[PDB]
Each structure stands twice: as C-alpha cells, then as structure tokens.
C-alpha cells in the first residue's frame, strides 16, 4: 500500500517534542502545520540521501547517505559514523 | 663518544631579563625573575620577546 503516513505522527509525540523543547501549552493550530514542517525537512534529507544512493547505483539507503545529506544541509550528526 | 656527560648538579635559575639570581618564576610568562621591578617590567613585554627568551633556553615554546 501507499498513503499520507505523516498522520503516523501521533499527537502525544508532538506534545512530547514540544515539552522537551520546554514549551508549556500547545494550541490546536500547531500540530498539523508542525507535521508539514517535519515532512518538509524529511523531503530534503530524503532527496539528498536518494541522490548519494544514486551515485552508488543502490536502492538501499544507509545511515551514511543521510549523514551526508545532513552535512550538505549543515545539521551534522555524531554517533552513526561519518 | 667525546661528548661530555649531562651535569651532575642541577642548573641555577638566572633571571632571563637581567641575569641576576632568580628566586622566582612567573606563572604567566614562565620566565625567571629576581626583583619586584623585574616583575613590573616582564608584564610589559610583548609575547614575541617572551617566547624569544624561552626559546633561548629550549623551554616550552618555538
């Protein structure tokens, strides 16, 4: 199957991320726009990871292809290697 | 084989800026100094001569 699985982002997870960010009260307007903003971030990271994977001729995305996307986006990550 | 041994007694501290005997070494500049007016003098030197004096005694800078 295929779907708009951004509605897999359950509302308590958005509340918890916001509460980890220390914001105390979260209006009903936040949630669906925040799903959009998260999706827009994933789209670029995935676009880039898919292109690092296309040079390697792979179908299989690794943690490296995303770490390289995160390098070109200037949001680098330590722990997965790279 | 003709190189003389390393010294058997320890080296004296002569003050870097004046050659007078140095009861003291500065925590900042790491030079050896003898008197209060020498301490007043060394804290007015540029870093270049401080590393110069240290290098002249093969100390902690190049």
């Amino acid at each position: 199957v295929l779907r708009d699985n951004i509605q897999g982002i359950t509302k308590p997870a958005i509340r918890r991320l916001a509460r980890r960010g220390g914001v105390k009260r979260i209006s009903g307007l936040i949630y669906e726009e925040t799903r959009g903003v998260l999706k827009v971030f994933l789209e670029n990271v995935i676009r880039d990871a898919v292109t690092y994977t296309e040079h390697a001729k792979r179908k299989t995305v690794t943690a490296m292809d995303v770490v390289y996307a995160l390098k070109r986006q200037g949001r680098t990550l330590y722990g997965f290697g790279g | 084989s003709i190189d003389a041994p390393p010294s058997f007694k320890p080296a004296k501290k002569y003050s870097d800026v004046s050659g007078l005997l140095a009861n003291y070494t500065d925590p900042q500049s790491k030079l050896r100094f003898s008197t209060i007016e020498e301490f007043s003098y060394i804290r007015r030197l540029p870093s270049d001569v401080v590393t110069g004096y240290l290098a002249l005694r093969k100390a902690t800078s190049i």
Partner: protein, 93 residues
C-alpha cells in the same frame, strides 16, 4: 491546571529516548521516499539516523519557538510563533 506540564518538561528533559513511535516513522520515511525514487530499501540504522535528525530538528525548532513565544510573553504557542522561528533562523524567504 498547568502544574503537571512542568513535571512533564522535567521528565522529558531528563530522559533521552525517541519521542515519535518507530514503526509510524519508519513508514513515513519510506512513504515520502517512494516518489523521489521507486521502491527504496533502507538499512535498519538509516531510519534511526533519520528519526534522530528529525527529532533533534524539532527540539531545536521548539527551543527557538519558546524564545519567540516568551518574547511575545504568551506561554502558549501557535503557528504565529513558528512562522517567526523559521523566517528568522533562515529556512523560509
């Protein structure tokens, strides 16, 4: 009301775990990717590296949004605040 929300903030800032559920996010990654290319495979760690970066990006967004909201004195947050945070950090316009 509103006292236990401070205890939630303390609890989630003391803990270090993933706040989004793994399986829904694992589908989200694949479901987005399937129109950048056909039938992507993902290594098991890759979905986690994606999720870590996304949750870190969201925590940083909420942190910057907190400063937006508390600048406007309101303790409650709205899109009215996030649309400053993106525009001023630099991802939009």
């Amino acid at each position: 009301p509103g006292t236990v929300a401070l205890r939630e903030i303390r609890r989630y800032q003391k803990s270090t775990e993933l706040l989004i559920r793994k399986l829904p996010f694992q589908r989200l990654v694949r479901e987005i990717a399937q129109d950048f290319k056909t039938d992507l495979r993902f290594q098991s760690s890759a979905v986690m590296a994606l999720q870590e970066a996304c949750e870190a990006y969201l925590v940083g967004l909420f942190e910057d949004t907190n400063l937006c909201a508390i600048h406007a004195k309101r303790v409650t947050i709205m899109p009215k605040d996030i649309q400053l945070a993106r525009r001023i950090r630099g991802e939009r316009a």
